[PDB]
Amino acid sequence: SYYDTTQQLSLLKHVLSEDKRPIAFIIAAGCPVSIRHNDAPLIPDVAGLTRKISDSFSLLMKIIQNLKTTIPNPTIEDILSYIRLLQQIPMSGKIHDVENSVINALEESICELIEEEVNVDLPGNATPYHKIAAWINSINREHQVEIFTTNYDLLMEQALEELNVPYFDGFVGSKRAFFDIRTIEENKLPSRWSKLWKLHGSINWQLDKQTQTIWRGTPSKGCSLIHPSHLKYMPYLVMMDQLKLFLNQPSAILITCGYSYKDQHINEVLSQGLQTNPNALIYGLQYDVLENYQEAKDMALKRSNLILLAKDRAIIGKKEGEWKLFFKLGDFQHLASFLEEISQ
Template sequence: MFLGAGAAKACGLPDVAELESRVRSTLGEADRAAFDRQMDGRNIEQVLSRLRRIAGLVTGEDKVDGLTADQAAALDTTVCQSIVRALDITDANLTPVGNLAAWIARADYRLPLEIFTVNYDLLLETALERFGVPYFDGFVGNLNACFRTELVESLPGADGAFVPSLFVRLWKLHGSVNWMRANGGHQVVRIGQPVPEGLPAAIYPSDAKYEESRRMPFIVLQDRLRRALHTPETLVIIAGYSFGDDHLNEMIFDAATRRERSEFVVFCYSDLPPELCERACRTPNVQLIGRAEAVLGGVRAGWKVPMDSTPDLWVGGEDGKLALPDFTHLASYLARSSGRGDYLREDSSINADSAVNGAQDV
């Protein structure tokens, strides 16, 4: 499963555009002006990469875009801290990720379930822990967990260390609000809470080729995604992702082209993007699922609501739209598919009792 910002938005967190707006509003006048210059023609992740290039390549009092190396590094830290604050899940609606966790808790497949996400928030970790679902995110430890490359790269049946299959794999491709840079920025550790004010959060991978150590563990996790996508006869579910990262997009479509017996199901909440439709029409094992139409087996057409439609799958009556592209409905559907009926409903919320019951079920 590959999750993007749409999954977090279904829980009440900001999407990319809103996140950029929130970050900008928290900056002081000088930082806001510098941030606006960097945002011209870029998104917030591209801004972070550019700031890190400036900090790494400029020396002394030399400036690029009006920033010295120290100023670029300071703005990078400030922006990351603003992101951490904006993604606070204290008031988030955990029902969608709770339903996802309920499905995961009962999933029993030959290979471990792997969840890849470009989100930084702690929604998934919170839901998995409340339902007692064991998971492995690449780090070992509690207070200052260290990244273990050999465990991330290990495969079932291979010699050496291997994390048991009952552990869900949770891979955060672009970092997390509880990843912190240590040892002068050359090591990433995971702590038990969002990174406190004044400390450098490890959000979004640096694309600086001149210092590979600053790109760990991101390059290992991207390689893990590539290998997972190329696993023969795999079902890949993609939800809440706007295909805004060209590098990840090419990995997905390259795997779809080479692994013809795998299935790639993409849920699109907005209208189907023309470029995605074109590629799906050329790649029959890529299924685009929109609310009003879909591309299935290379054929694009609109939906027709069936006479005996399953409850909660369609909204709006006879001329309605498919509900599954909304992550809230998709997660609820997956929870029901486990065959257990005690999934969370959209109008409920995770509470202490449901968390305990979920843990007991596991």
């Protein structure tokens, strides 16, 4: 009923010191929050973004109340999905009773505001991202380390470039950088080359004309494919398949930091992977009380090979217990320092 921090820390140190076993990562919105350039963090959290959209913009506020009838407090993703659905229907302006084209103007305004807010550079070489990048280059592992992100910024890319870290995000090309899909499944990539997948897109995505071919590059004004999933009839599907395929590797380990497990598709994929492969292990790291994560505790009770780490609570092997607050590893900077110490 009581757990020792030092035992888990030693277990993690032994795990990370291994070379052949595949490793991965998940970087959520809670990671950039732990890094601050001004008094506030360089990038706000999801709640901060929602509040900024709400107070920055009676007809406009109708949509927020309309979605709240069947769902809890709406977020950026829900609002963007509703705008996409509204644009799907041609004569959808009668619901808001505001013409039939103000939706496009609002979408352009919010996209421009999000791009302006997110297009920030991380200052200083002492950022945890640089520490992680250095740690990746320290040990020449037999299998490269993959990285999954659900953010919108390009902090990981810039950190990787700063320390000369080769990678491959599924895009090849200098000017247009068209999406190559056969080389992803062929998977005869360089051994030293790492991989980075942005599950929710970023500012460098732009959609072409009726050809609809996706490409990445310099962001353009009034265009940003920062849509989480949007809709289609796609890179998102192959990225999900890549994650699921990785989770089936023998003795695979996946580490989550700053992720609140609020999503449903990701949790379903993780549960399916854990059930399919009995040897996979996932380290759920939190920076709050475990009572806030109902889905995470439900999944930890359902699955046996899932480990959760919170400030004052932990669930290990279907047996919730208490620490001997504690577990200072929840913060992203502490994780980076641990990785740097392990590499050194």
